[PDB]
């Protein structure tokens, strides 16, 4: 069978864990992701924390709202970064976990700032205000020495709420 199209929420930051994010401050003009495939995030923070809190951004108030600046220099920002690439965890050595995300929206970085910048290979989606736990599917821990997922140790998020 051929797959169906994706639901479209009216609120572009419907997914935000911190709704104080000010969408009008995002620069440059964001190109919102309209697909709904699984996204991924490398993070060293453990699933007990992420499943309780979701992914909260570092600074929705005074953080770096410019996406190009945030991608290039990684200051505290209103964004939580994710990737289209299931395998990007292989490039994140420090990071103990590959989180699986099923969330509407997000700013498509390469569509917003182009695909010629230094980190275009990361195929990132930046979530303004972060990501509520109901949109975090689960996680797989990563074996650092082989850069592989420990698949018998993946865990589903009890708070995940499928929506499509």
């Amino acid at each position: 069978a051929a797959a169906p199209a994706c639901p479209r929420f009216d609120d572009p930051v419907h997914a935000a864990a911190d709704p104080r994010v000010d969408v009008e401050r995002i620069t440059p003009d964001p190109v919102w992701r309209t697909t709904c495939g699984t996204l991924y995030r490398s993070d060293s923070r453990g699933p007990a924390v992420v499943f309780e809190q979701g992914f909260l951004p570092k600074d929705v108030i005074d953080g770096q709202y410019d996406i190009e600046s945030y991608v290039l220099v990684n200051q505290p920002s209103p964004y939580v970064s994710t990737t289209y690439d299931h395998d990007l965890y292989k490039t994140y050595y420090k990071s103990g976990y590959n989180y699986y995300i099923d969330a509407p929206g997000g700013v498509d970085v390469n569509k917003t700032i182009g695909d010629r910048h230094k980190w275009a290979d990361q195929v990132e989606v930046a979530f303004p205000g972060g990501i509520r736990t109901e949109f975090v599917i689960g996680v797989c821990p990563v074996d650092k020495k082989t850069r592989t997922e420990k698949m018998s140790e993946c865990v589903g998020n009890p708070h995940y709420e499928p929506w499509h």
Side-chain angles (χ1 to χ4, degrees), residues 1-7 9-23 25-28 30-57 59-92 95-110 112-115 117 119-143 146-164:
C6 296
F9 289 88
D10 181 63
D11 182 357
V13 292
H14 181 80
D18 193 331
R20 294 177 302 170
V21 62
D22 186 357
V23 174
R25 279 216 271 154
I26 298 167
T27 61
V31 182
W32 299 98
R33 165 175 161 272
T34 61
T35 57
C36 56
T38 306
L39 302 175
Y40 309 87
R41 177 174 166 79
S42 285
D43 206 313
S44 54
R45 292 171 80 217
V49 180
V50 174
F51 293 173
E52 173 162 325
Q53 305 184 344
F55 288 110
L56 288 166
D59 190 354
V60 285
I61 305 300
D62 307 311
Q64 177 56 261
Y65 270 77
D66 185 76
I67 296 167
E68 192 183 19
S69 287
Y70 161 68
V71 166
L72 188 69
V73 180
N74 189 40
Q75 332 184 254
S77 87
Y79 307 109
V80 173
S81 292
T82 69
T83 179
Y84 289 110
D85 185 357
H86 172 275
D87 294 334
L88 194 66
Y89 76 89
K90 295 181 179 288
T91 70
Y92 278 99
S95 297
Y97 301 95
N98 192 33
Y99 283 92
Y100 289 49
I101 293 160
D102 179 21
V107 180
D108 186 310
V109 169
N110 288 357
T112 299
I113 69 168
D115 68 357
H117 62 94
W119 295 110
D121 57 352
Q122 312 280 296
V123 295
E124 286 186 311
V125 178
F127 280 86
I131 307 169
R132 286 202 297 285
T133 184
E134 47 258 51
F135 302 114
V136 178
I137 304 163
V139 69
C140 293
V142 175
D143 180 61
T146 57
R147 300 171 305 284
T148 58
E149 290 178 302
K150 303 179 182 183
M151 289 198 69
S152 292
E153 301 179 32
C154 305
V155 188
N157 178 11
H159 300 124
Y160 173 48
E161 295 189 28
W163 52 278
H164 63 94

